């Protein structure tokens, strides 16, 4: 994978199918892609597969299990502090790989499959070069932040917005993903 | 609580393609 | 004369 | 259904590309001229015709989706050809860029009108003409999105 970074989205389930599957915990659907649009009866957000693990934000997945074709799957990692949870990446998904170039120029992939430039202004923050209303970003928690070669730099967590417009975003650097695995 | 369910996906692996005729 | 579209390219490679 | 950002177009004389940015289907004036674009309801005329910039634009056709302009100022461009081939191009200036790996002109033929993308897949410019030395294209000429933005 590399550049230019292009992304597309595909809906696979609807409101009722999601609820039944949520309860049954058995999803026999075909899974493809590196980023999965995820949902609970509460909210919808994203989960990103990095190195065989499907990572998402704790404030969305809480400590719930992921519905798989073999019943619910318990989390592999939970880290309330890092705001991370991770389940084994579903069979069929493709994983991203952590960044290894230290690029300061990141690209956040929204739930609508829009790639938006973000200039890193710290270990867990970056600013939108072209701000957007906070609604553009709703549902995007857990989504990936990539460097020019399409490697994971971090997972979108919260947006630093003011007056209703997101000007910057706070993310979970891929390093926390490592510290969360070792412990 | 209930399980988190995959409701869709976003694919980065794709690359430019001439949309085939239907 | 008229310019006619003979095809289309989807940048993300999104399948039908 | 799937919508395309880049349309492959033709005139009796030639074939090239058009790119949809901001709701307008842009292409090179040296390809389209002042011709109208075909539609199921009859020919639709150019909204913009900037003969100077070698630029023309009609209202975006059907089965198309618009591309977003670049706002990251990257110099790492990527040219999408008429065969959906992607060619890495390093920007040399306002409207010029060098192919990272030169290609024989045939490979770039018929792609004018196509887009020059930044590492985020956003429109940096529109492919105007290939700058080749002895049949080998090693650079490209392009219309910056800002120009399209200005013409609107
Ligand atoms: C992500 O968790 C996220 O996208 N959440 C899913 C979501 O929004 N779902 C709803 C839904 O299912 O109903 C949805 C609405 C519309 C369309 C699709 C789905 C979220 C990212 C938000 C900011 C875009 N994260 C948050 O909500 N967080 C997490 C908190 C712990 C840090 N909170 C925020 O981002 C809030 N900002 C904030 O706390 O700033 C401080 C720093 C940490 C930057 C914003 C939430 C939205 C209103 C403005 C404040
Ligand atoms: Zn990198
Ligand atoms: Zn850009």
Cα–Cα distances in angstroms (integers) from residue D133 to residues D8, D100, D103, D105, D126, in the given order: 26, 15, 10, 9, 21
- Contact A104/A119 with Cβ under 8 angstroms? yes
Active site residue A59: yes
| Cβ-based burial of A131 (10 A; exposed 0-12, middle 13-18, buried ≥19) | middle
Which CATH fold topology does D2-67 show?
Thrombin, subunit H (2.40.10)
Query: Is any atom of ligand 1 closer than 6 Å to the C-beta of A126?
Result: no
End-to-end CA distance of chain B: 44
A74, A86 contact by CB (below 8 A): no
Are A26 and A68 in contact, with CB atoms under 8 Å apart? Answer: yes
Tokens of A41: 């009866």
CATH topology of domain A97-183: Thrombin, subunit H (2.40.10)
Residue bearing tokens 């490592």: A178
In A3-84, alpha helices (H): 15-24, 58-61
CB half-sphere exposure, D127, CA atoms < 13 A: 32
Structure-token match 């074939």, residue found: D15
Q: Which class in CATH covers the domain with range D68-152?
A: mainly beta
Give the number of the ligand closest to the Cα of residue D124.
Answer: 3
Question: Which resolution in angstroms does this entry have?
Answer: 2.6
Domain ranges in chain A?
1-96, 97-183
User: Is A151 within 8 Å of A143 (Cβ atoms)?
Assistant: no
Tokens (6 digits) for D112: 């004018």
Are D86 and D77 contacting, i.e. CB atoms less than 8 angstroms apart?
no
* Residue A124 to residue A120: CA distance in whole angstroms: 8
User: What are residue A144's DSSP bridge partners?
Assistant: A155
Rounded Cα distance between C10 and A84, Å, is 34
CB D7 within 8 A of CB C7: yes
Two tokens, residue D145 = 């999105």
Query: Quick one: which of D100, D82, D88 has its CA closest to D124?
Result: D88
Locate the ligand 1 atom nearest the alpha carbon of residue A160 and give its number. 44
Same fold, A1-96 and A97-183: yes
Q: Residues with Cβ < 8 Å from D85, sequence gap 6 or more? A: B16, D107
**φ, ψ at D29 (rounded to 5°):** -60, -30
CATH 2.40.10.120 fits A1-96, yes or no: yes
Q: Any CB–CB contact under 8 A between B2 and chain A?
A: yes
Kindly report the backbone phi and psi dihedral angles of residue D108, in degrees, each rounded to the nearest multiple of 5, phi listed first. -100, -5
Handedness of CA A8, A12, A18, A24 (dihedral sign): negative
Q: Which residues of A touch C10 (CB under 8 A)?
A: 8
Residue to probe by mutation, ligand 1, list A18, A118, A141, most atoms within 8 Å of CB: A141
Residue A19: CB within 6 Å of ligand 1?
no
User: Of the candidates D68, D86, D119, which has its C-beta nearest A107's C-beta?
Assistant: D119
Q: How far is D33 from chain B (nearest CA, A)?
A: 25
* Residue C10 with chain D: CB contacts under 8 Å: 2-5
């Amino acid at each position: 994978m590399g550049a230019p970074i292009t992304a597309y989205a595909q809906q696979t389930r609807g409101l009722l199918g999601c609820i039944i599957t949520s309860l049954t915990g058995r999803d026999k659907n075909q899974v493809e892609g590196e980023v999965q649009i995820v949902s609970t009866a509460t909210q919808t957000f994203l989960a990103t597969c990095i190195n065989g693990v499907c990572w998402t934000v704790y404030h969305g997945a809480g400590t719930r299990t992921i519905a798989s074709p073999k019943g619910p799957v318990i989390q592999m990692y939970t880290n309330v502090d890092q705001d991370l949870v991770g389940w084994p990446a579903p069979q069929g998904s493709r994983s991203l790989t952590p960044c290894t170039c230290g690029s300061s120029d990141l690209y956040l992939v929204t739930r609508h499959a829009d790639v938006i430039p973000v200039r890193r202004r710290g270990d867990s923050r970056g600013s939108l070069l072209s701000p957007r209303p906070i609604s553009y970003l709703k549902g995007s928690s857990g989504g990936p932040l990539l460097c020019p070669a399409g490697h994971a730099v971090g997972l979108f967590r919260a947006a630093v917005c003011t007056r209703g417009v997101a000007k910057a975003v706070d993310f979970i650097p891929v390093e926390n993903l490592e510290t969360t695995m070792r412990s | 609580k209930g399980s988190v369910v995959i409701v869709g996906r976003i694919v980065l692996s794709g690359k430019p393609a001439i949309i085939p005729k239907k």
